[model samples]
Target: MTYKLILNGKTLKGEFTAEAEDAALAEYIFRHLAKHQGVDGEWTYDDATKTFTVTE
Candidate 1:
């Protein structure tokens, strides 16, 4: 699959690869949650099972 990344009004250079898709997507998810006001929870990912947990 081809992935495109854009920031602000600019499109990031080069098409992204899926080699690190998990870590990449997880980074985005982590950042998203960090920006929430008063957000409190335990965020975890299981590499073996490829799963996630969000505990409040």
Candidate 2:
């Protein structure tokens, strides 16, 4: 599965297969965004596709 994150007009994309746990993937993407944006908020994950959408 793949996840695409967009913030501040920049897009960061990542991919995780079924072997990778959902929570772990979400955290990875969340941390990536947090480090780049310097803030954290709610994150939604799509189990079927393993995509995440984060909103600040």
Measured by TM-score, the strongest candidate is 2
> Every model's Cα RMSD, please?
10.9, 5.1
Instruction: Supply candidate 1's per-residue lDDT for 19.
Output: 28
Residue range 1-56, candidate 1, lDDT tens digits: 22222121122212122223556675465445444423335656555544444444
Error of 2 at 14 (Å): 12
> What is the C-alpha lDDT profile of model 2 across 1-56, one tens digit per residue?
34444332235333333333456765685566557665445666666665555555
Over all chains combined, what TM-score does candidate 2 have?
Answer: 0.44
lDDT scores of the candidates, listed in order: 0.39, 0.52
How high is each candidate's TM-score?
0.37, 0.44
Give the CA lDDT, 0 to 100, for residue 11 in model 2: 50
User: Would you list the clashing residue pairs of candidate 2?
Assistant: none
The per-residue C-alpha lDDT of model 2 at residue 16 equals 30
Query: After TM-score superposition, what is the CA distance of residue 31 in candidate 2 from its true location, in Å?
Result: 1.5
